[PDB]
Design a protein around this ligand. Structure first.
Ligand SMILES: *[C@@H](C)[C@H]1/C(=C/c2[nH]c(/C=C3N=C(/C=C4\NC(=O)C(CC)=C4C)C(C)=C\3CCC(=O)O)c(CCC(=O)O)c2C)NC(=O)[C@@H]1C
Ligand SMILES: *[C@H](C)[C@H]1/C(=C/c2[nH]c(/C=C3N=C(/C=C4\NC(=O)C(CC)=C4C)C(C)=C\3CCC(=O)O)c(CCC(=O)O)c2C)NC(=O)[C@@H]1C
Ligand SMILES: *[C@H](C)[C@H]1/C(=C/c2[nH]c(/C=C3N=C(/C=C4\NC(=O)C(CC)=C4C)C(C)=C\3CCC(=O)O)c(CCC(=O)O)c2C)NC(=O)[C@@H]1C
Ligand SMILES: *[C@H](C)[C@H]1/C(=C/c2[nH]c(/C=C3N=C(/C=C4\NC(=O)C(CC)=C4C)C(C)=C\3CCC(=O)O)c(CCC(=O)O)c2C)NC(=O)[C@@H]1C
Ligand SMILES: *[C@H](C)[C@H]1/C(=C/c2[nH]c(/C=C3N=C(/C=C4\NC(=O)C(CC)=C4C)C(C)=C\3CCC(=O)O)c(CCC(=O)O)c2C)NC(=O)[C@@H]1C
Ligand SMILES: *[C@H](C)[C@H]1/C(=C/c2[nH]c(/C=C3N=C(/C=C4\NC(=O)C(CC)=C4C)C(C)=C\3CCC(=O)O)c(CCC(=O)O)c2C)NC(=O)[C@@H]1C
Ligand SMILES: CCC1=C(C)/C(=C/C2=NC(=C\c3[nH]c(/C=C4\NC(=O)[C@H](C)[C@H]4CC)c(C)c3CCC(=O)O)/C(CCC(=O)O)=C2C)NC1=O
Ligand SMILES: CCC1=C(C)/C(=C/C2=NC(=C\c3[nH]c(/C=C4\NC(=O)[C@H](C)[C@H]4CC)c(C)c3CCC(=O)O)/C(CCC(=O)O)=C2C)NC1=O
Ligand SMILES: CCC1=C(C)/C(=C/C2=NC(=C\c3[nH]c(/C=C4\NC(=O)[C@H](C)[C@H]4CC)c(C)c3CCC(=O)O)/C(CCC(=O)O)=C2C)NC1=O
Ligand SMILES: CCC1=C(C)/C(=C/C2=NC(=C\c3[nH]c(/C=C4\NC(=O)[C@H](C)[C@H]4CC)c(C)c3CCC(=O)O)/C(CCC(=O)O)=C2C)NC1=O
Ligand SMILES: CCC1=C(C)/C(=C/C2=NC(=C\c3[nH]c(/C=C4\NC(=O)[C@H](C)[C@H]4CC)c(C)c3CCC(=O)O)/C(CCC(=O)O)=C2C)NC1=O
Lengths: 160, 48, 161, 160, 48, 169, 160, 160, 161, 169, 161
């Protein structure tokens, strides 16, 4: 979280908690009720996001769905909606934590070595989460979609 | 049988014709012809 | 139509007195909850058509009603139904920000006991589509507003039956 | 400030700043005009503070003015009255920056032993800042007293 | 107009008009409304 | 008649569902105030025969049109009938205070009350002031007994005001 | 109030509330503390307001208290002193609701026909509303006299 | 705009502009600098939006570029992308005008009978304006992409 | 039938261009006068009926137009002229809040001009009355708003003559 | 290190689930105390360099069996090292007070602390008394600062007691 | 490392005075543009493999340089050349976030001018690649923040040339 990142930086300099990170944390924790009613609506509409971005991906990238691509066949394209189910599930952990260390430790740090070892194109996921962002900003209101949409935009930068 | 009605009320009415073509849904569709579902609309074209 | 602001005014006017300290205290209870209602309206009106689509697929589709014989057969009787569930969603969110179900006594629940009987609409399916609409809009708006959204859905839901 | 905490935090990990600190950067940058209510009311009320704390020190501990002390001569007392407003200057750097990075690298790193290079002992000069806090916080308004109070509070811990 | 009355404030605006002006302006005020002219037109027989 | 428990039954019965998490937490919200409901209902009936007597003397000292020969509280034929017709508003406010909602008030006292008073010439106006002098007071004997007071102990009294009195705005 | 005026405007167009309309409610609810504080100055000092504007009307129109007048004598003036209690009650209902419909249903619709039947000149009692605007602005703040005084200039044009 | 909407609705009743809705004119006309600054970002990046949504449209629908369809060679594909530039002008016109009303007078109310007469498919244009939303809201901030996203949502509802 | 916002849209919709900086300069001159126009609307709200009286008491009602022989003599001709001088103002401040005389083009000038040539209402008295209403508006709203109020009155003087 | 938020992440990540109703109410229970967490953490660091000095003089006045030449706090080589080794227990108690749980205490200070002190001859015994004197001397400056106090801010400290000290019973 | 906050701290500290009005007009300008710069630093990091691609695919591919003979023929020269253009963009965004080019003076322009002539690197081609990377970035973030990178993109080009 931010609260881990404020401790761990203040632990490295071996001082106490600064007046700087006393007010980053206090401003985080008085926004704590606002972020959970952002992150509930992602989990409250998780079957709609996965179905719409699944509809949005495969028309953008028809080399995947066509045979000889990776997600071809009804068992394999069910796994690519499950492959995107995890990344929507991870983003709700990042919205609650206020940072991306749930994203980093679980869904970032070995991606390009794994997806090269599975046969899928790596940048085709980076279109899909970007297509997943374009239905998530239509859920929320405007001032919250800049907050939750940044966590989507972090995940694009890990892929490409 | 009286009934205490409000200061402003809307009686809900049924469009004699197309179901979606009530004016409470789309007010820009009340100028249309009702088509085959509704009654026959007359108009004057040919004057002698 | 009675707003919760105007309901304290209409209470305090007919006694003749001015605004009391207790009557001012009721408006501050409304104004502290005013942020939670206006958050709930703008997160619905962006995707009010999506809640209608997710509520008919939960309870009404692939049933007896959408089959031949049922009432959601023959698309005249289906486009009318999809705007009908659009009406309850649009009139719940007016009743949200009003904080008072007096809109639903005036513009919603007047004929709906008799107009559905006089059109052959089964009330036992539209009273479950309302509850299916509440179970998706609690997930879409939030757990805190979805109880208070669910007051004005169940006022419609008890009014139909 | 918060921005030099983030760039020097993202350089050695070789990565762009993520959304956990970019939300933290933007939250500081909307609070400038709140912090600027505190920075000028310290500024033009400087000379009211600078001897109301200086009389408060010697009525609490008179040994720096006692003969054989530290500011027993006037050329030391003219120096020591100057150092209060020097400390009032750098504290107001910290309330503007909202962090520790000006208040570290000007007047705090190494003062524990370089007063010992001079004649002035350490923990009496801790009492000088602690009486300077209540000489400033009485002048400050109460709802913004609690914001500027940890910036005075850090100088007590780091000097003692 | 080919419909019933809409509620109470739509009818209270007609009842004071025949209380003051008479019946001849009641039948006027139905016709030059927006709901007569833009839903029927100026060359149609009205229908229910 | 219809409790806050039983109103939540046919809020859930007509849709054919069981008791979920929202049912288990709204009903616990009624039960944590139930000690404060009952002990407020004792001290409302502590001097309830006095509480109508202190209210109506404070009413008729405030609106002296209703004593001098005008609107109907003129004789003791009217005045002792007025104290009885006041006393129903105090007594039924005790029931809905315990019952949670106002549905006991909805179909015992409120229905027909616009039509009973119009048939007699009893004004609806100072009846709203007569409940307005009790609902603020009733709170005095709850406050002097030490029970907290606010959310409820008015939930009932202004439902006798906002639904009995005719809508102006 | 604000929202139930904007609901009944949004019903005739048969549409949800605009984001250009919803921020009006968002601004009004957060600025709800200030308008109540305007309203207590009307209620808490209204014996000054009626008695001064009653003197201002009978100097601006001395034909009202003349013999052969409507408010002539001790008794008939006392309801004209009490009619201004009623109009001042609608302004302090109006500024709390923030809109014009609590004033419009109570004192605006039938007022051309009401004082027509009672024999009073309608614009003369409407002139006393204009004098009541001037005293209610004199006890009010800089911005608050412009916002709360706008409904006063509604009511003079309501009767006229 | 909201000015003419508050005039036409004030003229059908023939009233003199009740001061609930004159507060709307207070916050519309003063806040025009916020709305016209969104229009500078659309006009300044006009040549990027059309080209990046041109090839995105032709990937989704390769029927259009291919012979047999309705845009062959450079000549008809130029007017194809000019046709999007008529709409990017029109979304810019709707952002300044506060609401949607200068679009139906220009670009909505005959567009089904137009495009059927030209032989072009109607819903393939709706994929184009949907592709134009996916680039424009990425360029725009999140509190303003709710405002521009409302006018982009209308045009998809207009053509489909 | 449209305001100054969509006027410079429709001035710039033709010839295909977008909002250039000269057109933005026209929008910025309307936005900075947004404070002046709406408090000029609420100044003539409270004095709408007195400004019809004070106009015709300065110019009209002591002449031979109101004598028998004139045409403002009988009351059914008095009631229409006092309706017109009210509604000339009631569309003027509609055009003042909009920001162009395009409201006056579509609901004043296209019908009122050739009516008076066929009725026998005198029209030089109207422009002599609308000038008397012009100076008394600026003497009521203040000279800061009257110099932009009078151009909308002078649009009525230009078209009626 | 591992927040109360992030401990609830891998309480839910390893089973592969989303955030349900129990996740949304346990996390709100952390956030309602977060104003009381941070303002208690300010006033703990109000005189934290004094707070170790008042504790250890109250320690060594209570157990002289650590000043006179016995167990190792004898010279200022030991005593100023003792005040530093005390000061880590105050400083890391600030972090876990803000972080919610004690997992910052679990893998920064507690691991190896039974094995560092045994290699030096530092007793584990009065270290527990040294946190036990800091147990209530931290609550005094929270109480004199107007912060409410409770299990939060009086827990980090006995997690440094119940897991550092060896189990007897 | 000098933030624009810390730059006017240091220019006030060398005089030893408090913050004047003209120093605060640098802060309140910088506090105004805080939300603009944060929106730009997100969308660059989501596109930082595409801004580095469309800069080189516009200016450097199929040229002299990608052809055999000069400076990007082998793959290890190509991997080193895309390592620089990634690192220029990553160091340009810090000066966009700080509002001061002191990052570029300290961390980029120290050894870079000397080591390019010492390696035979064409300065005249890599001053063009950052120049080509500007109008990609000015289109990718919007021209309001596109006029913000142009100070700090060409601060590299002022130093490297
Ligand atoms: C004094 C003001 C001038 C004057 C006026 C006068 N007016 C009329 C009659 C009409 N005026 C109108 C006006 C309008 N119609 C519109 O659509 C608009 C735009 C809003 C306006 C201003 C209309 C329709 C009539 C006809 C009314 C009717 O019911 O027939 C008259 C004629 C009355 C008559 O029958 O003789 C006159 C005399 N008279 C003067 O002296 C001034 C020149
Ligand atoms: C006391 C020595 C004198 C006195 C005083 C008094 N009476 C009341 C109250 C009431 N008096 C009546 C009177 C009548 N009701 C009837 O039906 C008849 C026969 C026609 C009579 C004479 C009534 C109804 C009331 C109650 C309503 C009211 O307030 O007037 C008061 C006020 C008591 C209070 O403060 O609550 C007082 C002081 N009554 C006497 O008989 C003595 C002459
Ligand atoms: C006195 C403070 C007010 C007042 C009272 C008044 N009431 C009556 C008569 C009746 N009141 C009722 C009311 C109820 N009956 C019910 O069963 C219920 C629900 C429990 C209510 C609320 C009825 C039925 C009557 C008629 C007589 C009867 O009880 O059978 C009168 C008598 C009228 C008369 O002059 O005869 C009076 C005076 N009137 C006021 O002015 C006060 C506001
Ligand atoms: C005051 C005039 C006399 C005095 C009093 C005093 N000392 C202490 C505390 C300590 N003294 C020591 C002493 C030493 N440490 C060393 O390493 C050496 C060299 C071998 C010496 C002499 C230490 C470690 C302490 C702290 C631990 C303790 O409590 O003993 C006190 C107690 C202070 C308190 O209450 O906290 C007092 C009163 N010291 C002098 O030098 C004078 C002779
Ligand atoms: C003083 C009140 C108590 C006491 C302290 C004492 N400690 C030491 C030495 C060390 N303490 C540590 C502890 C930590 N290091 C860490 O990194 C952490 C986690 C943040 C902890 C808890 C270590 C490593 C040492 C060794 C020296 C060093 O720091 O490198 C001594 C010195 C022993 C000696 O005589 O030399 C003393 C005196 N001893 C007591 O009696 C008190 C209970
Ligand atoms: C690229 C289009 C141009 C180009 C690039 C190129 N550079 C190198 C070698 C180096 N580049 C650097 C760069 C930096 N050091 C820094 O500290 C920073 C700031 C973050 C930068 C940008 C360094 C240190 C070297 C030498 C060490 C190394 O191993 O890379 C090469 C390799 C040259 C070779 O002969 O192998 C290339 C190709 N050169 C061009 O042709 C383009 C104009
Ligand atoms: C007699 C007049 C009449 C019609 C036409 C009608 C259609 C109708 N089609 C439906 C679903 C459907 N219709 C289709 C059909 C198609 N989807 C496609 O992609 C193709 C374009 C297309 C045909 C080639 C599909 C896929 C569904 C189910 C939706 C889903 O699976 O999400 C449903 C909902 C479930 C059902 O009852 O079948 C209705 C009511 N109902 C009627 O009463
Ligand atoms: C909130 C206020 C409100 C209500 C209650 C309402 C009801 C309503 N439903 C109608 C038709 C209809 N409504 C339905 C709806 C349904 N039948 C089903 O099988 C489903 C359970 C259910 C919806 C999913 C159907 C099938 C018709 C067509 C009946 C017909 O046209 O004969 C009509 C007649 C056509 C019209 O004018 O729209 C009305 C007035 N309209 C309103 O504005
Ligand atoms: C930018 C950060 C910074 C500061 C503020 C600073 C101050 C500073 N204080 C000094 C001395 C002094 N400081 C004190 C202070 C005190 N004696 C007491 O009893 C009191 C507790 C305290 C009173 C305020 C005195 C008395 C001297 C003169 C000692 C001497 O120079 O002989 C000196 C040496 C001589 C001089 O310049 O006056 C410096 C450089 N140095 C720095 O680098
Ligand atoms: C809240 C809405 C409301 C309005 C508008 C209202 C008007 C109202 N004014 C009245 C009387 C009156 N009002 C006036 C007032 C005036 N005469 C003058 O000369 C002055 C110029 C002017 C006021 C300054 C007079 C003289 C009477 C007595 C008329 C009569 O009894 O013949 C009466 C009859 C006695 C009464 O019940 O007060 C009503 C009902 N009552 C209401 O409840
Ligand atoms: C002697 C060592 C050497 C290597 C390795 C080399 C690679 C190389 N390949 C390039 C382009 C390319 N290389 C390919 C090749 C391929 N893509 C495919 O789909 C084919 C299956 C595959 C062939 C293996 C393509 C399509 C381009 C053009 C990419 C573009 O223009 O976007 C370019 C950019 C143009 C240029 O400046 O030359 C370089 C430098 N050049 C060299 O001098």
């Amino acid at each position: 979280s931010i609260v881990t990142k404020s401790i761990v930086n203040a632990d490295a300099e071996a001082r106490y908690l600064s007046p700087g990170e006393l007010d980053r944390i206090k401003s985080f924790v008085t926004s704590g009720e606002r972020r959970v009613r952002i992150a509930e609506t992602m989990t409250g509409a998780r079957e709609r996001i996965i179905k719409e971005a699944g509809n949005q991906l495969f028309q953008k990238r028809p080399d995947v769905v066509s045979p000889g691509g990776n997600a071809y066949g009804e068992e394999m394209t069910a796994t690519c909606l499950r492959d995107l189910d995890y990344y929507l599930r991870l983003i709700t952990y990042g919205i609650v934590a206020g940072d991306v260390t749930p994203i980093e430790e679980i869904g970032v740090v070995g991606v390009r070595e794994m997806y090269k070892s599975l046969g899928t194109p790596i940048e085709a996921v980076a279109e899909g989460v970007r297509a997943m962002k374009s239905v998530a900003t239509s859920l929320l209101s405007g001032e919250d979609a800049a907050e939750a949409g940044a966590y989507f935009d972090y995940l694009i930068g890990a892929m490409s | 049988r009286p009934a205490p009605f409000g200061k402003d009320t809307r009686r809900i009415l049924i469009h004699n014709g197309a179901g979606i073509d009530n004016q409470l849904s789309n007010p820009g569709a009340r100028g249309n012809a009702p088509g085959s579902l509704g009654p026959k609309v007359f108009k004057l074209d040919q004057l002698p | 139509m009675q707003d919760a602001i105007t309901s304290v005014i209409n209470s305090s006017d007919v006694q003749g007195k001015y605004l009391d300290a207790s009557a001012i205290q009721k408006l501050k209870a409304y104004f502290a909850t005013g942020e939670l209602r206006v958050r709930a309206a703008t997160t619905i009106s962006a995707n009010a058509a999506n809640i209608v689509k997710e509520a008919v697929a939960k309870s009404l589709l692939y049933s007896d009603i959408t089959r031949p014989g049922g009432n959601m057969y023959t698309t005249r009787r289906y486009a009318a139904c999809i705007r009908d569930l659009d009406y309850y969603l649009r009139y719940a969110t007016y009743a949200m920000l009003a904080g008072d179900p007096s809109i639903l006594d005036e513009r919603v629940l007047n004929g709906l006991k008799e107009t559905y009987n006089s059109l052959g609409v089964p009330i036992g399916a539209t009273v479950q589509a309302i509850q299916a609409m509440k179970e998706v809009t609690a997930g879409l708006v939030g757990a805190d507003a979805g109880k208070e959204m669910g007051i004005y859905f169940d006022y419609i839901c008890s009014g139909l039956s | 400030t918060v921005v030099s905490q983030v760039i020097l935090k993202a350089d050695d990990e070789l990565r762009y700043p993520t959304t956990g600190e970019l939300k933290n950067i933007s939250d500081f940058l909307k609070t400038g005009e709140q912090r600027l209510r505190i920075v000028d009311t310290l500024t033009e009320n400087e000379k009211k503070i600078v001897d109301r704390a200086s009389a408060q020190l010697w009525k609490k501990r008179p040994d720096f003015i006692a003969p054989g002390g530290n500011a027993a001569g006037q050329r030391e007392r003219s120096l020591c009255l100057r150092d209060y407003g020097w400390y009032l200057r750098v504290i107001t750097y910290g309330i503007l920056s909202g962090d520790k990075d000006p208040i570290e690298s000007i007047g705090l790193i190494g003062v524990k032993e370089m007063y010992n290079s001079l004649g002035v002992p350490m923990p009496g000069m801790v009492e000088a800042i602690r009486c300077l806090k209540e000489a400033s916080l009485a002048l400050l308004d109460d709802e913004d007293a609690k914001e500027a109070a940890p910036y005075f509070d850090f100088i007590i811990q780091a000097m003692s | 107009l080919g419909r019933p009355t809409y509620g109470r404030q739509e009818m209270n605006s007609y009842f004071d008009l025949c209380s003051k002006k008479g019946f001849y302006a009641l039948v006027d005020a139905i016709i030059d409304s927006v709901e007569y002219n833009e839903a029927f037109g100026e060359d149609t027989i009205p229908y229910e | 008649m219809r409790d806050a428990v039983t109103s939540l039954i046919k809020n859930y019965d007509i849709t054919g569902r069981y008791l979920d998490r929202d049912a288990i937490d709204s009903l616990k919200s009624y039960f944590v105030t139930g000690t404060a409901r009952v002990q407020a209902a004792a001290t409302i009936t502590a001097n309830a025969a006095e509480l109508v007597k202190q209210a109506a003397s404070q009413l008729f000292g405030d609106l002296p049109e209703l004593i001098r020969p005008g609107g109907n509280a003129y004789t003791t034929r009217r005045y002792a009938a007025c104290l009885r017709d006041m006393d129903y508003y105090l007594r039924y406010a005790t029931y809905a205070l315990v019952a949670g909602d106002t549905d006991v008030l909805d179909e015992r006292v409120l229905q027909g009350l616009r039509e009973t008073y119009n048939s007699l010439g009893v004004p609806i106006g100072p009846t709203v002031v007569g409940i307005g002098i009790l609902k603020d007071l009733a709170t005095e004997k709850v406050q002097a007994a030490g029970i907290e007071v606010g959310a409820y102990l008015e939930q009932p009294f202004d439902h006798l005001i906002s639904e009995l009195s005719e809508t102006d705005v």
